[PDB]
């Protein structure tokens, strides 16, 4: 029964909203529902999760959501293997560095382009020490290079340069499709939980977001800034044959030029992230994330989110209680470039198998730069 149970739960929820009925009224109707799920994508996601979590800690969990950027359709959805258990694709989770892309959106919207040079040295902000993993830096480098290398220090400085600071990062993320609320969280990306501003940790993905939100927001990027609400229901026909709903019969949230520049910055990242380029030379745009466990040196959540123009997939790996460092069976720390990228690549390759390779739209000038500056 498994992963399809969690899909069914989301379909039911959506039908309830669509028809404004309770579940008993729905169940007795005998509706014939066509979902958006693509079996080929779904099978690829399920296989990838099984493969990469095999032999790992039995407390390890994963979630995968794949969305069609053309229309918001949910093509693959793995929230867990228990139909009657917890849906990890709906859980509020810290995103870590995968959230940096929204700071880049915000920057580009203000005319700060990919070639903007930022210092990567360590700094302290609001009394919190900001550093990069293994003290990595670039001296001073552009914000496209700092995204690829995932420099915390550079992205903190970039956020502070924005008009609105962390609020501008929240605005961009919300505009991209990070939902404003979900169950658990009445006001997302809000320190006071009431709609007030986020604090500076937003750029390092310290707020809770769902895996579905990340897939959807990156879908907006994949669609050159056009947002479509995510949905699971394609068509509904009555038991006796009357069509009641058909999705086959968007909103420019982010400017095309901005979104296409963000894409350009993200293009090298699947490969940079321990060689997770998609099969058959297929281009992609991606971003990893890895959160800290407490104040320890170990990891808590690991992410890979990335897209082609035809599919946006978010993957999270963590543990069931979210209270233990995240490691492999051999003791190795799990980063975004590890198991989540293995799952992401396998899901993407599988879901897109048999389709021709797409190229991304050529970016036009934003902040004085069109695409990633060529290096010296
Ligand atoms: C974003 O996720 C960044 N993550 C970190 O800096 C992790 O920080 C700590 C983790 C454990 C203990 C102390 C600090 C950068 N992005 C990551 C990614 O997966 O893209 C990274 C590992 C490359 S660093």
Keywords:
376 residues; alpha+beta; Beta-lactamase; five-stranded antiparallel β-sheet; three-stranded antiparallel β-sheet; 32% helix; binds the ligand *C(=O)[C@@H](NC(=O)COc1ccccc1)[C@@H]1N[C@@H](C(=O)O)C(C)(C)S1; Penicillin-binding protein 1A
Description:
By secondary structure, this protein is of the alpha+beta class. It has one domain (1-376): DD-peptidase/beta-lactamase superfamily (Beta-lactamase, 3-Layer(aba) Sandwich), CATH 3.40.710. Helices cover 32% and strands 19% of the residues. It contains 11 helices and 16 strands. The protein has helices at 2-19, 23-29, 39-53, 100-109, 143-149, 152-161, 166-176, 211-222, 256-266, 269-272, 339-352; strands at residues 32-35, 60-67, 74-78, 93-94, 117-119, 123-125, 128-130, 140-142, 208-209, 226-227, 233-237, 243-246, 251-252, 285-292, 299-308, 311-319. A 5-stranded antiparallel β-sheet has the order 3-2-16-15-14. Strand 2 (60-67) and strand 3 (74-78) form a beta hairpin. Helix 4 (100-109) crosses helix 7 (166-176) and helix 5 (143-149) crosses helix 9 (256-266). The N and C termini lie far apart (56 Å). Bound molecules: the ligand *C(=O)[C@@H](NC(=O)COc1ccccc1)[C@@H]1N[C@@H](C(=O)O)C(C)(C)S1. The ligand *C(=O)[C@@H](NC(=O)COc1ccccc1)[C@@H]1N[C@@H](C(=O)O)C(C)(C)S1 binds at residues 96-97, 133, 150, 152, 288-290, 292, 297, 299, 335-337. The active site is at residue 97. Residues 63-349 are annotated as: Transpeptidase. This is Penicillin-binding protein 1A.
